[PDB]
Amino acid sequence: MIKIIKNAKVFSPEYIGKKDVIFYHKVIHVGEGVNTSVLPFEHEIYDANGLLLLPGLIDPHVHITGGGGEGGFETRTPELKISDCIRSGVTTVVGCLGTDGITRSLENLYAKAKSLESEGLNTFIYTGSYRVPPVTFTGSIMRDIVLIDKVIGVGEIAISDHRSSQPTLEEILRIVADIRVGGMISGKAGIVNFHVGSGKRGIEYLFDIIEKTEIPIQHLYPTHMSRSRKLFEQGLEFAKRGGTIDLTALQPKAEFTTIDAICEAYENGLLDNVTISSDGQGSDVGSVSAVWYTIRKVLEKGLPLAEVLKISTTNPARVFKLNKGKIAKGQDADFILVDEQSFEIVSVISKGEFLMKDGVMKNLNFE
Amino acid sequence: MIKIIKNAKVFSPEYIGKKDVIFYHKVIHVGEGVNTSVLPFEHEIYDANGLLLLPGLIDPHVHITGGGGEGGFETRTPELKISDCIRSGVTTVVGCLGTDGITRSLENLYAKAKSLESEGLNTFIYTGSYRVPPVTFTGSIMRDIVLIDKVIGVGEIAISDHRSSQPTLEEILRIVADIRVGGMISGKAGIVNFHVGSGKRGIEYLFDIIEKTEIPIQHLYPTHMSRSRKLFEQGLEFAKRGGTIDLTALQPKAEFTTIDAICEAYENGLLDNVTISSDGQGSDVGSVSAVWYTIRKVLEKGLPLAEVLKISTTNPARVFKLNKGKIAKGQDADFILVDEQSFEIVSVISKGEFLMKDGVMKNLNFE
Amino acid sequence: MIKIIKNAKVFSPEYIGKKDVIFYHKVIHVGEGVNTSVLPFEHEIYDANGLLLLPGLIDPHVHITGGGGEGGFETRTPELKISDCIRSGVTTVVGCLGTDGITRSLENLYAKAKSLESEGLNTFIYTGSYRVPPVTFTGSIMRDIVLIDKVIGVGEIAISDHRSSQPTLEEILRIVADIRVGGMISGKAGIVNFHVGSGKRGIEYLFDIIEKTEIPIQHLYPTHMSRSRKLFEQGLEFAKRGGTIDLTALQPKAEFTTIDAICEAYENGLLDNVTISSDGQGSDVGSVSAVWYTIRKVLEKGLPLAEVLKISTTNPARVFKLNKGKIAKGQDADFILVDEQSFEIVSVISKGEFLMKDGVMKNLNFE
Amino acid sequence: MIKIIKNAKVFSPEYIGKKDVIFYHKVIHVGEGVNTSVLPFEHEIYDANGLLLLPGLIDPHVHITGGGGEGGFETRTPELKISDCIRSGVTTVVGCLGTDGITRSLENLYAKAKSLESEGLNTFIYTGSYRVPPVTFTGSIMRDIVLIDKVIGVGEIAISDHRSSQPTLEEILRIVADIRVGGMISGKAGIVNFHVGSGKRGIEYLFDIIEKTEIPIQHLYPTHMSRSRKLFEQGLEFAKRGGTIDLTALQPKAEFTTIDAICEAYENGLLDNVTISSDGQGSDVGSVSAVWYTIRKVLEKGLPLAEVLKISTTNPARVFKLNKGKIAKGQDADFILVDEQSFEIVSVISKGEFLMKDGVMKNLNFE
Ligand SMILES: [Zn+2]
Ligand SMILES: [Zn+2]
Ligand SMILES: [Zn+2]
Ligand SMILES: [Zn+2]
Ligand SMILES: [Zn+2]
Ligand SMILES: [Zn+2]
Ligand SMILES: [Zn+2]
Ligand SMILES: [Zn+2]
């Protein structure tokens, strides 16, 4: 069914004011309200007066199958619920494994990514986990990314962390070169996602790769880059050379935060190089609710919405080479509708289907 | 802490009337109320007047990690919640895999069994899954049962079913001989659990094993044996030769049922050879609530409670060689307290800890 | 871009006469010509007056990477050209390997299927090849169909043929059970495609599977079933029990033919159980042109077009569980436009893109 | 059966003087003698007047399956007898392999650990042996510690020794990181036990791990650290940074000894960082009798018993995260009874069972 959203202020994410959006699975037309609209086929209309229309948020780091286990088997966290995603405005998720690559399987990660997609979400996964050498579906990360549609990279590889497998630079280079080449063969981005711990070495290895080899900076995507001011300023040096860094969203649950980090990146013209992620179901427990929460905390510091949205729409889309994050002709019909007063998510659209309409969740399988 | 339950009618499961139970992790003493009780150490007392004290129920067939997936990735079911167990009177669970041995891992089954145990449940697992040759932790089912404490058998191996891997008698015999010998080395029972489908061959192979080889009938534990009157009467022939059969509990959610099956087994003196199981989280969805529900439906047909309890206490304990299912000195302190009028579970004790006291659930990690 | 085809007689494949079709990637609306059509967005119109609009043809058996090699390395055939497909009306192809599973790789089959899809074709592949035990991407055919989107089955497994690996019934049953279960987990059909040679045993094993096991007849898809009258009459017995059989299309390049076979199946009410395939690039050389050629030869025997089209639209779609073969709302916009006089293919549409418009091929990469 | 020890002076190991101990498998109550004791259940009383009650000794390094073989097949030593343990006051043993990882199997180490436990001992094992890369049950040390209850670490890895496999720092770091992460997932300590030879490098690598990585010092447990004054003073530098070191007990069978080592550690406030071990059945032959012998030699130098006991109770318990080494409520009922005059072991209790009562050994299987 073709649908039309009328009377919303649209952030594309660039503010283009009051515009009407016609979509199937892809956006057909953005423009001024028709006012004849005599249409020769069945079609749905949604009155979004009072609402902002945004691109659906992209969370590029979620433990969709559950994580935890750093404190024993009793610290394993539950799997992601799609209902959590819908009421937090997240329409696209990138799932990985974490510390535990033994009791959490890649095949379960894939299966979970496929069931989230069935219920109307958009999903991609990494192969590997914290440990080097990385777990694989097929015996090599290069075969994983060539043969399995949803695999977009390897991650999250731990460096400068007490849970790392203490990988060498040589081991890292082989993994980065394999996912880069596998990316080229398969027409995918080929991302290495680095879990960066609090170790003094920080992102040394990332600088070593770009200085000592021909490997472009765009495959290297460190996260937890707001863990400390010192790490975040190593991050801005990495951005200045063309890199993108990921900051762990503020959880709804205190000196230097992701909020400070985002404000510094803006003042220095590097907000194009910054993503945020929930680390949802991570070790208590990441919520995907952290993404819209974190955007709302940055707005309250005076930053314009067209600019803040980059961290959860334009920037993750560029990193993963997705046709998402943009309301525009031929882009995929993934949108959230926010109340212009309260800024509460009231409607959520993915592939042009309402997952949520005016606070009313669609029908789900175990909810 | 040493505890005492006073003023309950005790089913051990044999009815021994009004008796007092003193326990730590194991039962210290069953007998008449002290009426001096001047005890030289800290100690808890529970007034169970109005309540029946039962042995904790043993569900020998639960998909603790989730199952389903027969209808695509959207039909994968969620993992078991310990809270479901507690309020359904199940203190012991035996976890297996089902149709899906690809996206459901053995290591996850183990990890889940370990976290249920941390929260106060008693857990055992099978190695393998539906498919022959069976998935293993270590490359052989015999090494699995010798090296991994919780592995008590292989299961559930599908026979006479459209989801089976069409196993031969020779393949079955090798698997049964391996789990029997692995059982002997490890001092465990060595159970083969057969998923029996609706195929015309039924439990042919089980009769073939005992008639044509030296393999004792006690390792062979078919389930879904109330699927049809014809299969259940093959089951009673199997019981008459010394076998135990498992019947899928009636789900709280219509000619020949598990209720009819249990009543026939009683009238023919074969209730000692019968277990029930929820198939909890199985493909809608098995609930562990099915076990106490099914016991309550048999009571309403006039069968005595001391006799019905055998299917969820004495019989599963004998099959798996567990020190459970009996309220008696040196047995493990696993009990339920039922209201003598309503027959509602009001308290649940495992290893002598209250998981539930007077409808009040203990503190759990993601609940 | 939204497009509309005006003034064609539409075969859906049921004849619904002069109707107008509005589509993006999926069909939006079939119905009577608008005659106001004032549409508030960019949109393309195609005047198909003089043309029949058909569903795009589905060829379920093509050696897309090349085949041959039965007569030495000089008998290897070239890979499929997408241009061959377009000018033969084939919009969907199912690619497999044949006799040679050594020098022809599965990963090449996948890569070729992906490049045909990029140029605008719709592609699926089998895992395996002629030989039992079958070649795999990941070490098991069950993992292949669960993990790799395009894998829809195993094939083509040779039986009753001098190039077979002389597989046993037990080996066949394990392979059929694995692809059936892998199908259920992955939400795909799980087809076993049998290459049937001229050996006296014919499709004995197929009857053995359905008579002796619980395995439904719909997974079993023999081809070359018009090789002889005797084999084809074994085929009609298989159809009468619910099976679908595949007949090798007549090549444009003499007693009992595929034409006779199709006419017999119609007179006996079994045309619903019949597909044809080119065996394109097969050992001279199969052409995908055989499909439309074979449909044209059946029309010249007086059979109605709505009925003949079933063999290349409805029937392959049902076998592979595809949303193809039907012009109807929500179905994928794959169509051919035929001249009503000459019956020459003049336009070809896949995912709503013109691969060919009025004899003019789109822009291709090495053509 | 509940039991009570009356009239002993209790070292917990802190001296708490004349106290009474009530226990099942765990200690129920420590306190002043009841003097009413009218107890409503069967119960055993032991008159320990004239005896000191100590926590059962923990020997964290025993070749329970036999060792030796450095001088050819004729130098293989016999397996440990449980009777040796009982009459030497050792109630807990940690078993490993040594030089020979070829003819001594891990599965035998496990089996031996299980049979010692059956006869009433408490047992844990390491995976691996001297050689890097280390032998495993399952193909990785991380899977070994997650899947096998008794595996508490990897050991004993040889460094600075002529029998080492000359491991690199990188190989060591991977092994330490794997056992640390496997420890976290499994809720176990994750110990690397280093056999330190007489090579000039000593424990260089241990300092390299803590200085150059985020890996905490508590996983690193070198032994033979009294082999020389020079090595022992490297050991005290390691203790000063938070490490625990192991000293080979003096064998009952001459400048710088374990006695000197323990006295130096006390004078410098580092006795909390010191364990001793028999190296029992090691290459003549370690005896587990060395542990109580070595404690008796330190007492004869004037050190107080509450302090000396730390090396065989509190310190090994902290290293391995065991609920042992403490006489206290909820701790496991493992105790020795010593004659206050002669200091001879006269009774030994494990899990609250008498292995030895007044010089009378319990009934054993091949003794
Ligand atoms: Zn992380
Ligand atoms: Zn993470
Ligand atoms: Zn079943
Ligand atoms: Zn089941
Ligand atoms: Zn063929
Ligand atoms: Zn072929
Ligand atoms: Zn040593
Ligand atoms: Zn040693």
Which tokens go with B3? 């505890």
Beta-strand runs (E) in D82-213: 90-95, 122-127, 151-159, 191-196
Spell A96-114 as b/e; 16+ CB within 10 A means b: bbbbbbbbbbbbbbbbbbb
What is d(CA A155, CA A84) in angstroms, rounded to the nearest whole number?
23
Cis status, amide bond into B156, omega within 30 of 0: yes
Nearest residue in C to A3, CA atom: C28
β-bridge mates for residue C357, sequence order: C360
What is d(CA D323, CA D332) in angstroms, rounded to the nearest whole number?
6
Domain assignments of chain C as residue spans, ordered by start:
1-56+323-367, 57-322
Which tokens go with B143? 């090494």
Contacts of A9 (CB under 8 A, 6+ apart): A15, A17, A18, A51, A52, A53, A340
Q: Which of D41, D118, D150 to substitute to test the interface with B, most B CBs within 10 Å?
A: D41
Report residues near ion ligand 6: CB below 5 Å.
C 98, 279, 282
CB-based contact B118 A77, cutoff 8 Å: no
- Quote the DSSP letter at residue C13: S
How many helices (H) and strands (E) chain C has is answered by 10, 17
> Do chain B and chain C touch with ≥3 beta carbon pairs under 8 Å?
yes
Spell C281-293 as b/e; 16+ CB within 10 A means b: bbbebbbbbbbbb
Cα three-residue angle A275-A279-A283, rounded to 5 degrees:
150
- Strands C122-127, C90-95: parallel, antiparallel or unpaired by DSSP? parallel
Shortest distance between the Cα of B352 and any Cα of chain C, in A, equals 41
CB-nearest to B25 from D25, D38, D39 is D25
What is d(CA B337, CA D113) in angstroms, rounded to the nearest whole number?
39
Chain D residues with beta carbon closer than 8 angstroms to that of B136: none
Q: Which of B260, B254, B258, B237 is nearest to B246 (CA)?
A: B258
What is d(CA B37, CA B334) in angstroms, rounded to the nearest whole number?
23
CB atoms within 10 A of CB A46: 19
Cα–ligand 2 centroid distance for C240 (angstroms):
56
Specify the DSSP element, H or E, that contains D5: strand D2-11
What is d(CA A178, CA A148) in angstroms, rounded to the nearest whole number?
15
Ligand at minimal distance from the CA of B160 is 3
Encoded amino acid at D283, one letter: S
Specify the DSSP element, H or E, that contains D275: strand D274-277
Q: Which of C364, C306, C351, C338 is nearest to C88 (CA)?
A: C338
What is d(CA C313, CA C291) in angstroms, rounded to the nearest whole number?
11
Three-class SS string for D41-52?
A: CCEEEEECCCEE
Which tokens go with D252? 């009952």
Q: What is the DSSP track for B14-54?
A: SEEEEEEEEESSBEEEEES--S----SS-EEEEE-TTEEEE
Q: Which of C279, C334, C339, C358 is catalytic?
A: C279
Report residues near ion ligand 8: CB below 5 Å.
D 98, 279, 282
What is d(CA D147, CA A238) in angstroms, rounded to the nearest whole number?
41
Owner of token pair 């004032």 = C38
What is d(CA B93, CA B227) in angstroms, rounded to the nearest whole number?
22
Listed resolution, Å: 2.6
Q: Do residues D92 and D333 make contact, with C-beta atoms less than 8 angstroms apart?
A: no
What is d(CA B195, CA B221) in angstroms, rounded to the nearest whole number?
9
Longest dimension (CA), chain D: 66
What is d(CA B144, CA B164) in angstroms, rounded to the nearest whole number?
22
Residues recorded for chain B: 367
Cα three-residue angle D3-D8-D10, rounded to 5 degrees:
95
What is d(CA B166, CA C178) in angstroms, rounded to the nearest whole number?
9
Q: Do residues A258 and A249 make contact, with C-beta atoms less than 8 angstroms apart?
A: yes
What is d(CA D299, CA D335) in angstroms, rounded to the nearest whole number?
19
Which CA distances in Å does B22 have to B6, B27, B31, B41, B46? 9, 6, 9, 13, 10
Q: What is the DSSP track for B187-228?
A: TS--EEEEEE-S-TTTTHHHHHHHHHSS--GGGEEEE-TTS-
Encoded amino acid at D327, one letter: I
Three-class SS string for chain A?
A: CEEEEEEEEEECCCEEEEEEEEECCEEEEEECCCCCCCCCCCEEEEECCCEEEEECEEEEEECCCCCECCCCHHHECCCCCHHHHHCCCEEEEEECCCCCCCCCCHHHHHHHHHHHHHCCCEEEEEECCCCCCCCCCCCCHHHHHHHCCCEEEEEEEEECCCCCCCCCHHHHHHHHHHHHHHHHHHCCCCEEEEEECCCCCCCHHHHHHHHHCCCCHHHEEEECCCCCHHHHHHHHHHHHCCCCEEEECCCCCCCCCHHHHHHHHHHCCCHHHEEEECCECCCCCCCCCHHHHHHHHHHCCCCCHHHHHHHHCHHHHHHHCCCCCCCCCCCECCEEEEECCCCCEEEEEECCEEEEECCEECCCCCC
3-state secondary structure of D28: strand
- Quote the DSSP letter at residue C31: E
Experimental method: X-ray
Backbone angles phi, psi at C204, to 5 degrees: -40, -60
Cα three-residue angle C254-C260-C261, rounded to 5 degrees:
115
What is d(CA C110, CA C187) in angstroms, rounded to the nearest whole number?
20
Shortest distance between the Cα of D128 and any Cα of chain A, in A, equals 18
CB-nearest to A29 from C41, C107, C110 is C41
Shortest distance between the Cα of C322 and any Cα of chain B, in A, equals 15
What is d(CA A107, CA B103) in angstroms, rounded to the nearest whole number?
5
Owner of token pair 């087994």 = B265
What is d(CA B116, CA A97) in angstroms, rounded to the nearest whole number?
22
What is d(CA A94, CA A188) in angstroms, rounded to the nearest whole number?
14
Exposed, middle or buried: residue B263 (CB in 10 Å: 0-12, 13-18, 19+)?
A: middle
Q: Which of A74, A104, A106, A148 to substitute to test the interface with B, most B CBs within 10 Å?
A: A74
Cα–ligand 5 centroid distance for C103 (angstroms):
17
Which tokens go with B290? 């099915």
CB-based contact B110 D147, cutoff 8 Å: yes
Number of CB pairs, chain A paired with chain D, less than 8 A apart: 56
Q: Do residues C124 and C155 make contact, with C-beta atoms less than 8 angstroms apart?
A: no
Report yes or no: D17 at the A interface, CB cutoff 8 Å. no
Cis status, amide bond into D133, omega within 30 of 0: yes
Specify the DSSP element, H or E, that contains C92: strand C90-95
3-state secondary structure of C218: helix
Half-sphere exposure of B188 (CA within 13 A, CB side): 27
Sheet with A151-159, edge to edge strand ranges = A57-62, A90-95, A122-127, A151-159, A191-196, A220-223
Q: Do residues B191 and B152 make contact, with C-beta atoms less than 8 angstroms apart?
A: yes
What is d(CA C131, CA C139) in angstroms, rounded to the nearest whole number?
15
Q: Which of D59, D279, D332, D334 is catalytic?
A: D279
Owner of token pair 């941390």 = B118
What is d(CA A283, CA A69) in angstroms, rounded to the nearest whole number?
8
Q: Of chain D residues 178-217, which have a CB less than 8 A from chain B?
A: 185
